[PDB]
């Protein structure tokens, strides 16, 4: 029933203020971070106990060397982009790559870049093409599309390797990644009722009020509690002149709290 995902994020900053990394890379399975690297440590490090226990030192030593390479490539690509835009000072380059494994077996994959936090280049692995936001991106896309070997490499990586990595990491983090922690839900009282849920995992939760759904409802965001679980809320105001109830849905289970 659960869709799982593996995602890598890459951040490059030119002229970073003293101490701040020029380059950072973090991987995630779902919301759980699994790996980190930056230009300050210059070391690939696990970010889950189940990654440290199942991947030997030689894995981290190899991945360190790969990330030293990706850090240099980022610096060079960002410096070229700044030239193409006659930009100086600090500018941002971002890369995001990932796949999803669905319950049924179907997969998705994605790869995109941003310059200064705006879409730059988006890969379509089905048409083996790149969408480019502007002439500078278009010029780069056209060189990438002239290299059929690299496109086919990326499609195979997204569809086969990323998914094999995800399946390997799901097995390693089985007990953490596949668990359900059902929410604790309470109601508290300006004469408003707050429906408050916490201790839940995974983060996906639906919360509402009824009496007939209430239309004018404030929603708290799903926020991380820090201990691997999440919290959220839905509030309503009471017309002083009517029997109200909180409805929560989580991982296939429905909960109702009737308020007297």
């Amino acid at each position: 029933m659960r869709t799982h995902s593996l995602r890598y994020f890459r951040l490059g900053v030119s002229d970073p203020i003293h101490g701040v990394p020029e380059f950072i890379s973090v991987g995630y399975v779902d919301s759980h971070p699994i790996t980190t690297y930056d230009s300050v440590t210059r070391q690939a490090e696990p970010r889950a106990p189940w990654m440290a226990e199942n991947l030997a030192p030689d894995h981290w030593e190899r991945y360190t060397q790969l990330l030293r390479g990706w850090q240099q490539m980022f610096k060079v690509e960002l410096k070229r982009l700044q030239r193409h835009y006659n930009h100086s000072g600090s500018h941002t380059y971002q890369r995001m790559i990932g796949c999803e494994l669905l319950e049924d077996g179907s997969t998705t994959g994605f790869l995109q870049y941003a310059y200064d936090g705006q879409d730059f280049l988006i890969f379509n692995k089905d048409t083996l093409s790149w969408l480019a936001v502007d002439n500078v991106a278009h010029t780069i896309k056209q060189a990438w599309e002239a290299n059929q070997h690299e496109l086919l490499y990326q499609k195979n990586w997204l569809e086969e390797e990323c998914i094999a990595w995800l399946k390997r990491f799901l097995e390693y983090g089985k007990d953490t990644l596949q668990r359900t922690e059902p929410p604790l839900v309470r109601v508290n009282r300006v004469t408003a009722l707050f429906c408050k849920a916490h201790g839940f995992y995974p983060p996906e939760i639906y919360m509402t009020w009824m009496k007939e759904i209430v239309q004018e409802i404030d929603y708290g965001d799903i926020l991380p509690s820090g201990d691997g679980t999440y919290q959220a809320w839905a509030s309503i105001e009471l017309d002083p002149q009517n029997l109200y109830s909180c409805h929560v849905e989580h991982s296939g289970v429905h909960m109702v709290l009737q308020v007297p």
């Epitope: 894995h59 190899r62 991945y63 790969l66 086969e160």
Partner: antibody
Framework: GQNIDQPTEMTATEGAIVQINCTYQ??????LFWYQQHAGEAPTFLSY??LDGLEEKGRFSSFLSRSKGYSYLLLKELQMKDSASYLC??????????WGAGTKLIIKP | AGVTQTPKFQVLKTGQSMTLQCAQD?????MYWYRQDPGMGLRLIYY???????DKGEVPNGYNVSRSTTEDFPLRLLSAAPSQTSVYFC???????????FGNGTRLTVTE
């Protein structure tokens, strides 16, 4: 990244065709390469396959079967200058380049 | 103009030190040293994923390298031994998955 095999030596007639086979075994794959090495010279890149199918370029073709773990290099209208070693190699999941022992192609006039 | 590797031939006495030079002006991030021995296939001695870093291959013992620049990846035999009699190939690649460009090789003999 476990194993790779290709014949030691092959012999074909000038003007004909030859197919050099390469088998590989690996849990993890990022593409298979063919390189040509003339005696007393450096290896030179010929081809890259990562999906199933057949790539063609002049007299040369490269085929890959992911399920069988199997590539071939096909050389058509063989010339004396095609006498060389042909090296297959494949990238594993960590980008280890694994080299076959090479196949020497002798072209008989 | 590709990968430049010098020298093309070298005789050394057991115990001598030697530096093989390798340069590429293609801005490739990856540089490699391999030795080639009859039957043995291509064995990786050392590689560099970028300037500022290096790492061992299959057979690093008796050898050293440095990567001060994108362009250059020197290979050092600190104490020439007869077992290092071989053909050495420097190579570069744009990325970890892209094709290798090879230098024209160093044929090295170590005699007593």
């Amino acid at each position: 990244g476990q194993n790779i095999d290709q014949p030691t030596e092959m012999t074909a007639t000038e003007g004909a065709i030859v197919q050099i086979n390469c088998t590989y075994q690996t849990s993890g794959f990022n593409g298979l390469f063919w390189y040509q090495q003339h005696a007393g010279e450096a290896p030179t890149f010929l081809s890259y396959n990562v999906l199933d199918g057949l790539e063609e370029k002049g007299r040369f073709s490269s085929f890959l079967s992911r399920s069988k773990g199997y590539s071939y290099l096909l050389l058509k209208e063989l010339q004396m200058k095609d006498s060389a070693s042909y090296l297959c190699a494949f990238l594993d999941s960590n980008y280890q380049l694994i080299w076959g022992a090479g196949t020497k192609l002798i072209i008989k006039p | 103009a590709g990968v430049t590797q010098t020298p093309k031939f070298q005789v050394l006495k057991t115990g001598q030190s030697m530096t093989l030079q390798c340069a590429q002006d293609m801005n490739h991030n990856y540089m490699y040293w391999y030795r080639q021995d009859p039957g043995m296939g291509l064995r990786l001695i050392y590689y560099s994923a970028s300037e500022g870093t290096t790492d061992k291959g299959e057979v690093p013992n008796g050898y050293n390298v440095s990567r001060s620049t994108t362009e250059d990846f020197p290979l050092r035999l600190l104490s020439a031994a007869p077992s290092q009699t071989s053909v050495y190939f420097c190579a570069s690649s744009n990325r970890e998955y892209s094709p290798l460009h090879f230098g024209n090789g160093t044929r090295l003999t170590v005699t007593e």
